[PDB]
Symmetry: C2
């Protein structure tokens, strides 16, 4: 309807698609919502897995959002130094009821200057990059600070989105969506956190992430300097 809650996700090359699509299917289940996928122009955008998503609007044509949500992914590094995207996020965040992100999307909120003195989380492997952007790093899966709501790494988007659903509507509605999603997880292993995975597996990861972390640190401190100026 013309009165729908306006929810917008940033959609960019090399997005981690589940950061977007988990929350999208949660939130699109809610009463009278309209969900936008926003980029430089409408059209196909390739996620880091090769899954092709489709932006529905340019930045300029996106209507004022009630909720803005930034997903993460490899593509976050470029986005953190994209003035067009950061300006859009700042404009929308000035008036949005909720300003939100999943996984390394919070590094983009940070680059936009929106985390200074704010509690936030991100993907576990990149968590040390929050503080140089002014954030107070919090090791929880969903972190709230006023109208800021950030989720942890990738699949945390589902927990984040159900939390947001309860704020937008009510607990009854969020629970109904949870039940419709049959979201009673039973993971076949206990390796979803660096605090519980086998040590051998954890060591595989930090090593797999190490080059990216150095590059993302470089980018983070440049983004921070632009804020500092």
């Amino acid at each position: 309807s013309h009165m729908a809650v306006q929810i917008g996700f940033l959609l960019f090359p090399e997005v981690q698609q589940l950061d977007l699509t988990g929350p999208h299917d949660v939130l699109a289940s809610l009463p009278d919502v309209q969900v936008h996928l926003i980029w430089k122009e409408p059209g196909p955008v390739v996620a880091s897995s090769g899954l092709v998503l489709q932006a529905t609007t340019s930045f300029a044509d996106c209507p004022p959002l009630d909720v803005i949500c930034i997903p993460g992914g490899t593509g976050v590094g470029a986005l953190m130094e994209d003035p067009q995207a950061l300006a859009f996020i700042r404009q929308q965040a000035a008036r949005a009821r909720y300003v939100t992100s999943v996984s390394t999307g919070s590094l983009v909120l940070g680059a936009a200057g929106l985390l200074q003195g704010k509690r936030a989380t991100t993907h576990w492997a990149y968590h040390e990059l929050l503080a140089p952007l002014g954030a107070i790093p919090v090791h929880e899966r969903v972190v709230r600070d006023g109208n800021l709501l950030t989720g942890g790494g990738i699949t945390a988007g589902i927990d984040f989105a159900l939390t947001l659903a309860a704020e937008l509507f009510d607990a009854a509605t969020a629970q109904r969506v949870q039940l419709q999603l049959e979201y009673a997880p039973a993971p076949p292993f206990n390796a979803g956190s660096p605090d519980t995975a086998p040590a051998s597996v954890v060591q595989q990861a930090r090593q797999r992430a190490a080059d990216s972390l150095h590059k993302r640190r470089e980018i983070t401190l440049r983004a921070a300097a632009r804020l500092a100026a």
Copy 2:
């Protein structure tokens, strides 16, 4: 020699049934993942999210894994002879024949659940038996080379299970960690066994029209298999 993994991408798919498993499995080494429909191009999910089929049926390579997601669009597929025959074509030689949520109703309509243990989305579970399945009320159900997941978000649990079978436990564990899949749901309403009764009723109400329709479709699909 890469593992060839194919998802059926159909109009009115429940996108998370596909995209959850896709991001799990595409994280694995030496895989190629396909999104299959009657032609390549845009396919719109039940939410209005637009996805893109990468291959027609014809151009799809022989699959190691076929995976059918669910969605509103399942009812049409259950009476689509092309889709069902394609699924049978791929299932004949696939190492793993799989589904998430109401995708198992499509496997059922195709004849591929006859005498097999299987699950589906809780709200439609009664439709498994008429399609010949032995219904099992578990989140991931294996019967030989058949693997079926429960409703929507069960796809993540299913895909990690499959990852360990295709590779090994350590590999599945690494993907789990990269996904940070340590869920912490904000409510306890993920199953009809734990959700408040009011919530279960609200969900059953919203399922009622499609369940009625799908009962009718199911009886027709079953009659075709019996004959």
